[PDB]
Amino acid sequence: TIKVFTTVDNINLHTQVVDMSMTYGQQFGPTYLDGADVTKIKPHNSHEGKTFYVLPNDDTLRVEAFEYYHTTDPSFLGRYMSALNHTKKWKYPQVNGLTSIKWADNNSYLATALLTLQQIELKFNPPALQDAYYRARAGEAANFCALILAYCNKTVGELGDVRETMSYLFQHANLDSCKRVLNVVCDTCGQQQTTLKGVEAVMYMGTLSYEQFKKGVQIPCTCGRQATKYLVQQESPFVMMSAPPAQYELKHGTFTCASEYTGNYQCGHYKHITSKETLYCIDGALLTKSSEYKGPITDVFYKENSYTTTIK
Amino acid sequence: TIKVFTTVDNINLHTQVVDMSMTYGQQFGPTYLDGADVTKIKPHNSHEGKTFYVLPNDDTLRVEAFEYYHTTDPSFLGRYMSALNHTKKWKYPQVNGLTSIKWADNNSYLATALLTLQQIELKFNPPALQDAYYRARAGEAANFCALILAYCNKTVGELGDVRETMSYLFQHANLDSCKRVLNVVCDTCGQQQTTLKGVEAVMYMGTLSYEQFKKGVQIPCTCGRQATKYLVQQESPFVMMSAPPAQYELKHGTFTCASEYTGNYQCGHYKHITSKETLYCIDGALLTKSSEYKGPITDVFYKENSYTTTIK
Ligand SMILES: [Cl-]
Ligand SMILES: [Cl-]
Ligand SMILES: [Cl-]
Ligand SMILES: [Cl-]
Ligand code: NA
Ligand code: NA
Ligand SMILES: [Zn+2]
Ligand SMILES: [Zn+2]
CATH class of the missing domain: 3.10.20.540 (Papain-like viral protease, N-terminal domain)
Structure with a gap:
């Protein structure tokens, strides 16, 4: 023994x-x-x-698991270990100053997520994510990638969705201060204001353009008629604007980073575009530079702090 | 080579x-x-x-040190390593369910600080403190104690002050949401309101009694005449009430924990009192239980969330 x-x-x-x-x-x-x-x-x-x-099979281990991972699902640790067996074998090269991931097991959605996190202000709450992300930025991202999969209930090899993945991660982040107030103008119903907080305050689905979000976008009212929704006030370190993939032009110096998706739900592939001195397409371990870029964009991230509209 | x-x-x-x-x-x-x-x-x-x-002697190491420790003082790492050589030799027993420290090198102020942190809601920002505190709660507090000394510019063996130590630690913690509004009533000058945020919102020096702080305490006005200061609103997970050491009675079930100081600035000793099912005096590795307690109290911690006064 x-x-x-x-x-x-x-x-x-x-x-x-x-x-x-x-x-x-x-x-x-x-x-x-x-x-x-x-x-x-x-x-x-x-x-x-x-x-x-x-696996936490007694109450002492359950509390320790909850304190470390911020989840009570007992099978989390097994999902985390199973994914970790594979992610340890992935390569995490430095591309354009960021930790990326060499392509493997349909992991493009994880790479663009990781690349994005290194370009926006975000702090994680769970000790496990705090420690794994610090190491990930240092080039040892196996644990961080395995944690993402465990938190998202995805297994290695599954095709993933960046917006859904960022949503899971944002829930484990400190977005307490984040606030968004919107106004919907229906010339039949009037003005209807709403206030969002936390993750709902940084994520929006329907349009990629933050500026168009401020000018106003056409969206059905609750009565069914076409109305206008525009941004009244934003208080956040960043905003994530998403929309179903469609051809879209990314202008240099007007955004932080974006996700491009080519394909469908049974087979596809993500690429990451970031605005530095010039547009840079980070494709796992591959890197391409261009003065301009256009493609099937699905997420665009912008830096923010405080915005108040001027519309009356 | x-x-x-x-x-x-x-x-x-x-x-x-x-x-x-x-x-x-x-x-x-x-x-x-x-x-x-x-x-x-x-x-x-x-x-x-x-x-x-x-020691960070090039710009790459300086940025890494700043990201990990949240300080730009280059000598921090040397102060941290020097203290760590000693704290590794300390003992960190579990006393009354908390990680304490067996007495050594006049470290009573560090033990009561550590004991206090395990009883109030506080999250650290620097990765180094996040990692060291998680291990400290697990009974391996050498790195955490060495970090405290480095952050406070204290060396092993120096007599320390809990309130000053908690002040340093609170600066490296997330107290963004914390808010305090006070009102000073001088029957010659009128009402003068002030608003405090962050660490100033949780720390007060002058009285140990949170309830007396709400009822009103006599403090000189800016004009010099005696006035009354009372708590108008508090928004915090806890409050720290301090005062120069003086005989004081700690009532069971009316506070969270407190610091007792016996002695002076050249020689003294801290003890920690916590209110559980009964009052418990944690004295490093020593433990004593009592139905009541009285001594030279200097800090008292209370749990809070939201308080609004009723005074007109
Ligand atoms: Cl590592
Ligand atoms: Cl931007
Ligand atoms: Cl450890
Ligand atoms: Cl209390
Ligand atoms: Na970041
Ligand atoms: Na605590
Ligand atoms: Zn309508
Ligand atoms: Zn006065």
């Missing part, structure tokens, strides 16, 4: 003594060592003193 | 090749390995591939 440590966060360690003739599963249940599933593996002499991840 | 890594955060590693005949100082300047000062030590065969801390 040998002494090991079990954990859910690699910080709070629990001592265990295991029988070398039984599998780690019969004793601990699902068990992982350095991201490898050892549930059906019998203890080995070379395992002594090492640290093993396990 | 050998290959090593230099760092300021143990995450961003920089490869180096060192001559085994020169000291790490002549090549890197101040150098630390696992918290030990190796500046005057010549490289050894057993050092190959290991990670060394160095």
Whole structure:
């Protein structure tokens, strides 16, 4: 027999003594060592003193998992470890000053998400994400990518959606101060104001142009007639403007970054465009520079702080 | 010669090749390995591939240090490493469900500070503090204690002040939402309202009683005459009420925790009192329980969320 440590966060360690003739599963249940599933593996002499991840099956581990990951779903740790086995094998090159991801397992949506996070002001709340994102920016993004997949209930290889992924991440971020007030003008119903906070204050679906959002966009009223919705006030470090993919021109110096999607829900591919001294198309490990850019844009990010309209 | 890594955060590693005949100082300047000062030590065969801390002497390291520690003082890392050499030797026992510190090097002010942090809602901003505090709550508080000393410009062994220490820590915490409005009534000058935000909104010096703060305390007006200051509105997860040490009775169930100071500035000692099912005096590694408590109290912490006065 040998002494090991079990954990859910690699910080709070629990001592265990295991029988070398039984599998780690019969004793601990699902068990992982350095991201490898050892549930059906019998203890080995070379395992002594090492640290093993396990599913939170007692209340002490559940609280530790909740404190570290900010979720109560007990299967989260297993989803995280399963994804991590693959993401450790991905490559995370520095492209145009940012940590990207070499293409693998249909991971283009994760790369453009990661590239985007490095260009907007966003702080994560869960300790696990705080630690994984700091390492991700340093070029070791395996844990961060595996966490994203676990939080989004996606498995490695699944085609992903950036806007939906950013939505999950934003929920685990500090957007407390963010505020948005909108006005819908229906010349039959009048003016109807709304106020949004948190993630609803930074995400909008329907138009890519922040400026058109301020001038006014045509959207059906609650009565069904065509009305006009325009931005009254915004208080945020950034705004995410999304719309179904359609040909769209990205003007240099008028946005921060954007996501391009080519394909459909069974097969497609994301590319990332960022406005630096010139437009740069970051395509995983590939990089292309252009004076102008046009393509099927689906998300556009803009920097903000405080905006108040002038419309009466 | 050998290959090593230099760092300021143990995450961003920089490869180096060192001559085994020169000291790490002549090549890197101040150098630390696992918290030990190796500046005057010549490289050894057993050092190959290991990670060394160095002072940020180029702009790449300076930015990394700033991102990790949220300070631009270049000597911070040296102060942190010097303190860490000692705090690694301290003991961090679990007392009354909290991570305390066995007494050493006049560290009572650090223990009551640490005990207090585990009982109030507070999130740190610097990655270094986020990581060290999470480990501190797990019983490995050496790095967290060493960071406190570095941030407060205190060395191991120096007598410390809890209120001043909490002030430094609060600056590196998210108190954005915190707000306090006060009213001073001088029957000669009238009503004069003030609004405080951030750390000024949670800390007050002059009285230990939050309730007396709401009823009104006698404090000189700006004109010099005696006036009355009372709490108009508070928006915070907690408030810290401090006053010069004086005999004071701590009533069970009417506060969260408090600091007791016995002595003076050349020699003294802190004790921590917390209100659980009964009053508990946590004295480093020592623990005492009592139905009632009285002593030279100097800080008292209370839980809050939203308070609006009723005074006209
Ligand atoms: Cl790392
Ligand atoms: Cl922008
Ligand atoms: Cl640790
Ligand atoms: Cl209280
Ligand atoms: Na960012
Ligand atoms: Na706390
Ligand atoms: Zn209408
Ligand atoms: Zn006066």
